[PDB]
Subunit: 238 residues, 5 copies
């Protein structure tokens, strides 16, 4: 019910955690693993009041990673507890952590200075689909970007928004402000049924003048499929 209270509202932290599965996990008998999966489900369900957790299968799409959590929380302290709890699970004890990025979502900064025609197009909701592809791209702006005045950056971001608009219907997007919580300024999240559209989306943004201000683009670029936690861990049950 309060699902969207975290996915859209501001002041909401957003955390990306990646995990890789150890070798010993398959030494466990199939029965012992199926049980282990249930412990996680409950931990998530027990935490379903304070946070929100969505899972993605990165195995075979992203290098050196199997599982990613997108955890929403009113405070990062709560996410700290959950991740510690998750890694304390018998399943989690057979997981080696592989990267962690936090980012708080905020109300738009440059959109207000856009054309009223452009503002409208942005209210085109996007792509709402079941089990879509998911992409995560961290970004760091160069010192030059921050030196610019508010009007200049606003105009640059209008050029940014303009090139992306014809992909709004097929590519969902969300932005996390990450500066000061790690080594990145932004975390970008995307959902798509057609990866070819998302690709064309990116080269289209390679055309704008904004791209040259990106000191860091990707590294790592997390690609994966979106699916309920049960089916992912089920694939780990064999």
């Amino acid at each position: 019910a309060d699902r969207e209270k975290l996915l859209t509202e501001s002041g909401v932290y957003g955390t990306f955690a990646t995990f890789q599965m150890d070798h010993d996990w398959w030494d466990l008998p199939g029965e012992s693993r199926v049980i282990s999966v249930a412990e996680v489900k409950g931990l998530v369900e027990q935490w379903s009041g304070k946070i929100l957790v969505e899972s993605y299968l990165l195995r075979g799409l992203s290098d050196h990673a199997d599982l990613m959590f997108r955890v929403h929380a009113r405070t990062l302290s709560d996410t700290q507890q959950f991740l510690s709890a998750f890694m304390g699970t018998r399943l989690g004890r057979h997981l080696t952590s592989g990267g962690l990025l936090h980012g708080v979502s905020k109300k738009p900064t440059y959109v207000a200075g856009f054309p009223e025609s452009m503002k409208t197009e942005l209210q085109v909701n996007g792509e709402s689909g079941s089990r879509p592809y998911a992409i995560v791209i961290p970004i760091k702006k160069d010192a030059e970007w921050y030196a610019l005045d508010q009007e200049a950056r606003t105009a640059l971001m209008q050029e940014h928004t303009q090139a992306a608009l014809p992909y709004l219907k097929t590519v969902k997007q969300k932005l996390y402000h990450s500066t000061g919580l790690d080594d990145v300024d932004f975390i970008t999240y995307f959902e798509t049924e057609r990866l070819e559209d998302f690709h064309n989306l990116v080269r289209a943004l390679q055309q704008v003048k904004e791209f040259r201000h990106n000191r860091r683009f990707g590294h790592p670029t997390l690609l994966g499929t979106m699916s309920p936690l049960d089916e992912i861990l089920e694939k780990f049950a064999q």
Copy 2:
């Protein structure tokens, strides 16, 4: 029969996976190894209906690698399943991944604006030989490249193509558009019986003005021999 329908048609994703074999693999008794090899062979044959898998021996040609998969599929979802099954396999659980790159094939962008004399020579298929050397080079363009207009880049790529033409008869080439699926913009793939030609090919392309725009060239530069999957896995028995 259904084979060439993927290697030439557009919309076909192409995935490159590299693996290295652990030390613990040789601690395993031979009997355990022969079964592990057998588990892999059938699984590949089991997946021969939805995708295409070719194997390459990087052992002794590429550092920290023994095996490379060139997997073609209309959807990355299928490739994700295959790779996940493969790395869960008893052989695969003794494999460490060493890079993973996706790239969708596309309809040529600059060829249409070429001289008709150049277009024709490009339609020359190339040299078809058995068990050739294979090189894979990922490439990332600098921010300047994407800033240029359609005419400048086109002229640059004609200068590119021009230097490459005398190698068409001895070097097969194919290009995958990779931006947004990982940390690279392109994936280049080559087959040749003559490595000395491939070398001369590259320095010839080092002279052109396009080359200076490659922020990343190689890293890693994958070299290997092309051969059936059985023969590679055969070497891990004994």
Copy 3:
């Protein structure tokens, strides 16, 4: 404790550790005895150094524990850290970070206008169990070429944009050149991260930010809880 967190000439070390998998393969009572060994080690050193504990687990990747050790002589800090890694607990820890930084009298403060000076004597965030952020910084070559005046001016614009955060963000600077691969170690306590997030974005606008060659890497983030509260979470 005030002698070490305030005075100059007091070194500050930042040790980061991550726990092994096979630590959880150890029987539950062994972890208890292990934890009990560490407290006695810190206690025997309390008369020479000051050890503060942090919990990076679930906030800072490839990290579980962080120490902030203060000592007027770095030798004392060396004996301790080798001993901690010698302890049964420490033999199951892969250290992944170690930064030293001495404290010194302010360089560019006296040059500042005294309106700003008085605002720097203003208390600051006095919180309990707050978030903690450690950022290492390396200046470029151009920075050190600039004369004192040109640099003192740049730190004025620096101190300026930071003033609205002084009450919600605690700060401490460690001079770290020639002890590791960074020039400065910045340490911050705060109950509000969005506040601290603002402080950085605000500081990104000054021209002094241009002269930061290495910014972050790694950017450590965790909660500042007492030692026992972190070690009790380990035995389970």
Copy 4:
């Protein structure tokens, strides 16, 4: 053999290996049997390739042994190297870098003065068990942008600075572009490392050096000796 160390069209492969900890857990007798397997494999391949060995243990970090393998085709080098790492000894070896480079007939020497051409025909240093250095090199985009005359002139300046070291430093160059991540592989033999050192700083003065985008990384240093004596030293 000498038809391979000098003729053009000859591929040259550099393989580095590090010895595991588990190898020394093995009793001495178990190793000697393993050593014997390698000797035969080399002799079995002595028809299609040529193999020279180097002791990097204690001179280059994270390395004990290096192979310099000459062959007209890399496939043969591939078979040998794949077989070698399958050897009982090779199953206790972790691979540590691999660089190929085909030898070709000189490009710029022809445009040199005959006074310089002659001095280059001075064979070099022939010594027993000399030091050996291997340096991979990548040229910047600017170098390849130059037309044929400047590079020719630049390499004449290169050759000029190197001449007083010909009698004490043997050298050979491999064209490596397209087979890995480097453009060239340089190989040197010298009884006097101090000579080789003075040689390198002498070449740091020329205008060519600035066009070297990548210089070394890794820089392989080692001693040259028969394969038997190296492997024997890995015994007991």
Copy 5:
């Protein structure tokens, strides 16, 4: 003699760092104490051709426990010693963590300095017991080597000028390392007061030479100087 390696030129200097495995603590204490005794002798057995000094980097430098500063007239001898050491039972529980060689030479630019500066330079420095020790590798940019002998000489005089007030509290040593590894220089320092050593470096960050340092540190090795036995004693129980 004893002194022929710490001052003379043509003497190679090698820096080897090692980290201690986890399996080392699986061994019973006495078995380790014996291993310590084995190492002591190997050093003394080699005490004729080379010189070995040891440093504790455990808890001061990341990912390192022990460092050797080995001086030898030939690198071949140092190669043998390290191979024996890493083959030693203690050494089989050691993982190597970086290796840099550098030959000491007679000064290149000092001759062109004022004798007022030369005199102050003849002050050897501070000889103290168990001082801190710092190792900083350095690589100069291509621009530096493009400069003529006079400019570089003047730049190095500016370097020397800034360092002088630290001569009495900071010992300095320079190794010419180009061609033996991936660095051009290796710098070694001893001081009882690290606070002095810090001020020394930012003072040297002001000069125009510093911008020519393509690589400065990476890694920057810090540690304590002490006899090999007392260091190894800590690796026993």
